[PDB]
Design a protein around this ligand. Structure first.
Ligand code: ATP
Ligand code: ATP
Ligand code: ATP
Ligand code: MG
Ligand code: MG
Ligand code: MG
Lengths: 412, 1030
């Protein structure tokens, strides 16, 4: 397979699952990815793209304006080997997630194409310019030359975009290959630039794409992210140290774990740092929701739609860990006293929801042990709906306890 | 490593000869003999269990190619063999050593083994006789040396390993039953009967559904055509004396008016298949009826299969899988997934299978407006979950006049058709086994005998399949119920459906509705089930409609029956019943198949119409054997996992043990047990792998693990549904009670564990009460005797039967027998029974609630469970005379447990002998003199108080020591340090832990408090004179 230019030949195709490993070399290269030493590499240069994901469009016009999905716009990258990642996963560079126009997150699948560039595309001989169009308002432009350093200088490709401060890297000119281009070895004498000025009539056509703006809330953008409100935690009780091992075994007795303890003993912060550690160590995806917010709990159908949404989302991503805060408000037995249990019918409104959830998840879990797990939080093991225990949905368990004076002081 | 593989006639201890190149990757001076990892890929979905062999270099083999001895695979090379292995070299060449070695030999040779008069003489002769090498021999259980010789029975701590010829168990076993004569290495004794070479056709060979799908790689021929062979059938070399033509790659069958042409190929020795049958892919068996086909014919006309079909015709087969918009989108795109790379090869009216992943419903499968080359890569990431049949509607064509006998679709041709639905019978499980090919969550294969009610239900349905020839519409229906949840009703019906070859429709009433019974909503409930029924049933199949958990919809309200509540439900149940009748009138058969939990509250106005009322039990001990067999079956554990290590049980387990230790458990508990075991096994595996050393390349399961899990499960049951504070004490600690505890314990032992004397209709000592003074422990002995036979346990903690609501407070009484009946081998204990037992002749005042609860309770515990034998009830109260009348036969307790004061000096010593054991006893003076010193007026609580005082005083003495040492150390410092900063952080056992001496007992022996005055004992014995002196 030789492409539209005889300079380029196509070698092999694979699909791989995106993960985070926090290895990058921004002072050297950006538009690059790293692949396991077990995934023996046919070529260090290639093309990649997100495998687009969105809901079925199960309703006419999807109830919203956008008519058709934007194409993949696949980007060429360098590929470099490392042992530090598990098989078939990919480390995707920080300045590449933003090009793929979604927050950096272990999750969606990547396309990977392996490529040959022939001697027809070696150093020099096409001293091409590139437009650096400003896609949003900025200081009166800095020099184009500095971008040859600050983009690392490793690689480029036509029609590149960088939303971090909204610049477009694009060229469409004769006497250039208009493809993947080398840059790492190339002298700055062999390249030119246009720091092309602002213009609404140009940018508004690009803004017709899917643009769920990533930093729409004011935080000084990616330039400074003036929005931190979090920290580490004081490692008081080792509960983290047990659970993070357990919940990441190759296989588990049942899909569910329950976490309980006295009000204010610190469920929430602990869950946040369990999330963060799981999100950093072993490539598990998370989706997280609060019983306060999904106020559909007055109705069945839309709530059912939410549960099927979470199920589907999980099953399309990699291994994932669903976590729920104060589950009693969603699935708890609605009267703590049994009372008259609706003339002993016992099926009050709530339990239906939980039954549908357990049925769906069980159907998933019988397929493959990793595909989903769930982590409840509540006040007391025995106060949540016994039907949760009846079906043997949960087994292993932990409780937090009043921290012992020694660690308590070390916390203080 | 995907090493190339070759086989040799060489024997079970001939070496492997390894490839001359790969020796550079493995051969090194560290090992005197090489040992390598043998994993020949067998037919199967799972990987290969690990084997290990003695190895040598081969000087001659082609690159990356290996010779193996055939004998370890249970065959000689009489037929062609697989040409690759997943071989691996072993780091440091290390091998485990067996503790157990065993060998089964026929009686005649065994006589020679006995004629060898000593173990060392036996070893010396026989190892040389068998050409074995000392230490250098490595073997497996289920190695068979030769026919009639050396079946390897059991090995430990591994199933395979090295033998220490100096110190291993080399166990003689005599094959007194000649079982070895049943063993064979596949070798034929003679040429097979009547070869038919040169005949155009052959007969008397069957067809047989595959146990699983087989890869593109496992067939030796693999011609490069992108789509040519999907039907991919195969047969062993027997075909070569049936088909004379060179094992030709495609052959044809016709019977019953059909046409089939089938791609047919060889089969290899590494196999479990039987002779003389075509092993049949699903698409083959679906095209034939359930009637057998036993015929084959040679033809070359494949070139006449028309390479252009200018149009394409098809239809979906009807089924519940087709009715829903929330599936139609995936089904419609599955059309594309099908016809892409499904170049047709076959006659019209064919049944092509296709399958999909039901999770995918809400997902963009990322092909529309993506194109390029991704779709089969996602198809490599997915795996399917449910399967639908497509019917090959006859094409109407103009490229050729021949249209019916066979045609080829090519996706370069743009047509399809969607003629709504066609109706066709679904295949019977006994022939098809269809589930196991596509690997879905298999239904449990019931047998037709051992769960007799299943035979009842499946016959009840079969009535209406069979009566279809008699033309009568039988209108058969059934209504399943159980006294407890989790009995698998739905799965059992599913089984029946697949076994009989009959469609099934399923809807779950916990799911079906946007709301429960409510105002202005009966239409919103009932129309939904009406619509979803109408969408399929009158179109296609035998009529089978399954409704789960109907009690959600069909309910009856006795009280709180206000109009705005009652009128809706009361309309609802009829408004359904009329629809049920309408379905039974309009459609053929209309087999309603209901299910419910608590049967009592099904609407009688509905249930009267129903008929068979099958009650499905909790599984007996004889049943659950089959349950465990299923879940421990290799199929059920070597799936949902994906790491290459396989899992198995091993021969130390025996289902009998679990059958002894498992009862009162549902199938869900059994599954949870087995998976808890699998979790423990994998955890043990990886944790050991963290240490360098010998461990198996497979994960193994133990009886002690299973037992521990069973205890865990029974605890989880007791915590969720049973009582808190389960039976949890050593009977060893209830000292001093004598033949009184003898008669008690025997009275509760014998009906529990010698049932042949007790499996009878007469009364059998169902209840006991206790009336000793306080301070002799009744409450302890109750939980202890419960622990002695693992009785189910419920404690009435006194007055909690009472409640505010006159007219409902008695409900806790019915509850007691509800929970007892739910926990058949149970002990029910009313502690402080006086709290609900005044004088039965109470008062001439009002008949207040205190009388109405107790008399009703006594009457019901006299009048019920007296027939439903099994329960036991216990009561204790330290004051006899208030339980005056219920000591007569109508109160039935009738048992004289004056569990009172001790009577003998040794027995009172036996108290402290049973009690003190948990701390360190002094014996520098002997115990008996304490009993001699005691006035004969004390009880176990008193002897407890004495030992407690003594040991606490000794703790105060060691405290008064170490506090002095701390004070001295403080004076040796700033006298101001934190009390933690020395003796505690040093954790000095010597200065802190248990010490005692008998002089602290003798000093504590005076200061007790005998609050049971002798006047009290005298009064109680005076009552005993008429309660018990008889
Ligand atoms: N172990 C800990 N490590 C770090 N911070 C902690 C820890 N325990 C408590 N905190 C701090 O105290 C706060 C109180 O806990 P948190 O807000 O998470 O409670 P919560 O689980 O939401 O409580 P509840 O749901 O009972 O109201 C945390 O937000 C965090 O700032
Ligand atoms: N007798 C059995 N043999 C084998 N597996 C069983 C058996 N009973 C239950 N199981 C397993 O446990 C599961 C029980 O779930 P199922 O949907 O069958 O229950 P159900 O009949 O709806 O129960 P319930 O109405 O009491 O909640 C089955 O799907 C199956 O995997
Ligand atoms: N083997 C034994 N023989 C006699 N007494 C014992 C024995 N083991 C323990 N005891 C004592 O029996 C005492 C229990 O006394 P008793 O049965 O009167 O109390 P209880 O269980 O509170 O009573 P109730 O049945 O009224 O609820 C315990 O405090 C313990 O010291
Ligand atoms: Mg909280
Ligand atoms: Mg059920
Ligand atoms: Mg008591």
């Amino acid at each position: 397979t030789i492409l539209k230019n005889g300079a380029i030949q196509l070698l092999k195709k694979v699909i791989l699952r995106s993960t985070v490993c926090k290895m990058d070399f921004p002072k050297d290269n950006l538009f690059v990815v790293y692949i396991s030493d077990g995934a023996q590499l046919p070529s260090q240069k290639g093309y990649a793209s997100i495998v687009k994901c969105s809901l079925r469009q199960s309703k006419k016009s999807d109830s919203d304006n956008k008519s058709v999905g934007i194409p993949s716009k696949k980007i060429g990258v360098f590929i470099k080997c490392d042992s530090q990642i598990p098989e078939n996963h990919i480390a995707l560079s920080s300045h590449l997630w933003d090009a793929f126009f979604t927050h950096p997150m272990n999750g969606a699948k990547i396309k990977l194409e392996f490529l040959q560039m022939n001697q027809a595309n070696i150093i020099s001989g096409r001293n091409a310019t590139v437009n650096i169009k400003y896609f949003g308002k900025d200081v009166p432009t800095k020099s184009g030359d500095q971008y040859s350093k600050l983009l690392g200088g490793s690689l480029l490709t036509n029609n590149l975009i960088l939303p971090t401060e909204q610049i477009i890297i694009e060229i469409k000119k004769g006497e250039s290959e208009q493809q993947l281009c080398n840059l790492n070895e190339i002298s700055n004498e062999s390249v030119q630039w246009k720091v092309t000025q602002m213009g609404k009539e140009e940018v508004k056509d690009i803004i017709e794409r899917h643009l769920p703006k990533h930093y729409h809330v004011k935080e000084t953008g990616e330039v400074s992210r003036t929005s931190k409100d979090e920290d580490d935690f004081i490692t008081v009780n080792s509960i983290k140290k047990e659970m993070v091992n357990y919940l990441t075994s190759p296989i588990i007795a049942t899909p569910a774990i329950i976490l309980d303890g006295k009000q204010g003993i610190g469920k929430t912060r602990l869950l946040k740092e369990l999330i963060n550690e799981v999100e950093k160590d072993h490539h598990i995806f998370v989706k997280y929701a609060d019983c306060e917010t999904l106020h559909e709990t007055s109705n069945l159908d839309k709530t059912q739609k939410l549960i099927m949404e979470w199920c589907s989302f999980c099953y399309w991503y990699g291994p994932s860990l669903i976590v729920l805060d104060n589950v009693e408000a969603l699935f708890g037995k609605p009267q703590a006293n049994d009372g008259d249990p609706s003339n002993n019918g016992q099926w009050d409104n709530a339990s239906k929801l939980l039954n549908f959830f357990i049925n769906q998840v069980t159907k998933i879990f019988n397929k493959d042990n990793k595909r989903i797990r769930v982590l409840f939080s509540g006040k007391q093991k025995t106060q949540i709906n016994p039907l949760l225990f009846d079906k043997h949905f949960v087994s292993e368990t932990w409780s937090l306890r009043a921290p012992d004076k020694h660690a308590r002081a070390k916390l203080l | 490593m995907k090493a190339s593989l070759t086989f040799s006639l060489s024997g079970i201890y001939a070496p492997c000869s390894i490839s001359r190149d790969i020796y550079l990757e493995y051969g090194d001076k560290k090992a005197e003999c090489l040992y390598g990892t043998i994993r020949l890929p067998q037919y199967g979905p799972g990987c290969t269990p690990g084997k290990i062999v003695h190895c040598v270099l081969d000087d001659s083999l082609p690159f990356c190619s290996i010779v193996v001895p055939s004998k370890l695979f249970g065959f000689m090379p009489t037929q062609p063999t697989m040409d690759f292995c997943y071989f691996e070299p072993i780091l440091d060449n290390v091998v485990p050593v067996l503790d157990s070695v065993t060998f089964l030999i026929n009686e005649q040779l065994y006589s020679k083994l006995m004629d060898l008069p000593q173990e060392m003489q036996q070893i010396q002769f026989l190892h040389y006789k068998y050409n074995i090498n000392s230490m250098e021999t490595v073997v497996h259980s289920r190695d068979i040396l030769t026919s009639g010789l050396c079946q390897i029975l059991n090995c430990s701590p591994f199933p395979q390993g090295l033998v220490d010829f100096t110190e291993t168990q080399l166990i003689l076993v005599n094959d007194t039953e000649q079982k070895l004569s049943a063993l064979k290495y596949a070798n034929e004794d003679e040429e097979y009967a009547l070869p038919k070479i040169g005949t155009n056709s052959a007969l008397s060979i069957d067809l047989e559904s595959l146990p699983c799908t087989i890869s593109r790689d496992l067939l030796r021929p693999a011609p490069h055509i992108n789509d040519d062979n999907s039907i991919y059938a195969f047969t062993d070399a027997e075909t070569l004396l049936r088909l004379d033509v060179t094992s030709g790659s495609f052959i044809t069958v016709s019977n019953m008016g059909c046409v089939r042409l089938v791609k047919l190929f060889v089969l290899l020795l590494p196999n479990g298949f039987k002779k003389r049958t075509i092993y049949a892919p699903p698409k083959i068996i679906a095209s034939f009826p359930d009637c057998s086909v036993v015929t084959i014919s040679k033809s070359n006309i494949g070139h006449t299969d028309i390479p252009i079909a200018n149009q394409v015709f098809i239809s979906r087969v009807g089924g519940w899988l087709q009715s829903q918009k929330c599936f139609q989108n995936i089904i419609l795109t599955t059309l594309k997934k099908f016809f892409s790379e499904s170049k047709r090869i076959l006659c019209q009216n064919d049944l092509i299978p296709i399958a999909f992943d039901s999770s995918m419903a809400d997902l963009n499968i990322a092909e529309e407006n993506d194109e390029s080359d991704d779709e089969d890569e996602l198809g490599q990431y997915y795996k399917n979950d449910s399967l639908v049949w497509f019917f090959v509607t006859s094409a109407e064509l103009d490229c050729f006049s021949k249209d019916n006998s066979h045609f080829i679709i090519d996706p370069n041709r743009t047509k399809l058709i969607t003629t709504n639905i066609t109706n066709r019978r679904p295949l019977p499980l006994s022939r098809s086994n269809l589930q196991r090919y596509y690997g879905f969550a298999e239904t449990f294969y019931y047998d037709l005998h051992i769960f007799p009610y299943v035979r009842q239900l499946v016959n009840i349905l079969e009535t209406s399949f069979n009566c279809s020839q008699r033309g009568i519409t039988l209108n058969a229906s059934v209504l399943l119920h159980s006294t407890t949840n989790n009995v698998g009703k739905a799965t059992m019906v599913r089984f029946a459906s697949k076994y009989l070859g009959i469609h099934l429709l399923e809807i779950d009433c916990l799911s079906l509705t946007s709301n429960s019974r409510q105002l202005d909503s009966t239409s919103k409930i009932i129309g939904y089930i009406r619509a979803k029924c109408e969408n399929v049933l009158p179109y296609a199949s035998p009529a089978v409609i399954f409704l789960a958990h109907l009690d959600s919809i069909l309910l009856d309200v006795n009280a709180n029956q206000d109009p705005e509540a009652i009128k809706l439900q009361k309309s609802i149940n009829f408004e359904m019943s009329k629809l049920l009748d309408d379905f039974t009138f309009k459609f053929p058969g209309t087999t309603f198949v209901g299910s419910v939990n608590n049967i009592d509250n099904v609407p009688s106005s509905f249930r009267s119409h129903m008929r068979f009322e099958i009650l499905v039990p909790v599984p007996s001990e004889a049943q659950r054997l089959r349950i465990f067999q299923w879940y421990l079956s290799s199929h059920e554990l070597n799936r949902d996992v994906q790491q290459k290590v396989p899992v198995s049980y091993m021969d130390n387990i025996s289902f009998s043990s679990l059958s002894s230790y498992s009862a009162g458990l549902t199938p869900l508990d059994i599954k949870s047990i087995v998976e808890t075991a699998r979790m423990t096994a994998t955890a043990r595996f990886y944790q050991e792998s963290k240490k360098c050393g010998w461990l198996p390349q497979s994960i193994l399961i133990t009886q002690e693990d299973l037992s521990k899990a069973t205890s865990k499960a029974r605890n989880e049951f007791s915590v969720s549904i049973g009582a808190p504070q389960i039976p949890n004490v050593t009977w060893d600690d209830i000292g001093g009670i004598d033949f009184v505890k003898g008669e008690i314990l025997d009275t509760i032992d014998m009906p529990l564990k010698h049932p042949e004397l007790f499996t009878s209709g007469m009364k059998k000592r169902s209840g006991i009460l206790f009336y000793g003074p306080p301070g002799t422990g009744k409450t302890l002995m109750a939980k202890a005797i419960a622990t002695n036979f693992s009785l189910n346990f419920f404690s009435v903690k006194g007055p909690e039967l009472l409640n505010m609501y006159i007219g409902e407070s008695e409900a806790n009484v019915r509850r007691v027998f509800q929970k007892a009946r739910e926990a058949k081998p149970c002990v029910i204990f009313f502690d402080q029974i006086d709290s609900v037992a005044p004088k039965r002749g109470n008062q001439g005042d009002s008949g207040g609630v205190m009388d109405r609860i107790v008399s009703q309770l006594l009457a019901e515990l006299d009048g019920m469970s007296t027939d439903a034998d099994g329960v036991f009830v216990i009561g204790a109260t330290n004051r006899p005379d208030l339980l005056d009348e219920a000591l007569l036969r109508p109160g039935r307790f009738d048992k004289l447990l004056y569990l009172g004061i001790p009577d003998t000096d040794t027995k009172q010593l036996n108290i402290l002998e049973a009690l003190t054991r948990k701390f360190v006893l002094d014996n520098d003076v002997k115990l008996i003199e304490l009993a001699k010193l005691c006035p004969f007026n004390y009880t176990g609580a008193d002897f407890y108080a004495l030992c407690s005082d003594a040991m606490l005083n000794a703790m105060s003495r060691i405290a008064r020591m170490v506090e002095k040492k701390v004070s001295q150390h403080n004076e040796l410092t700033g006298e101001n340090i934190s009390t933690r900063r020395w003796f505690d952080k040093i954790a000095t056992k010597e200065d802190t832990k248990v010490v005692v001496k008998m002089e602290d007992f003798l000093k504590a022996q005076e200061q007790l408090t005998p609050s049971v005055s002798r006047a009290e004992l005298n009064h109680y014995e005076a009552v005993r004179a008429n309660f018990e002196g008889a």
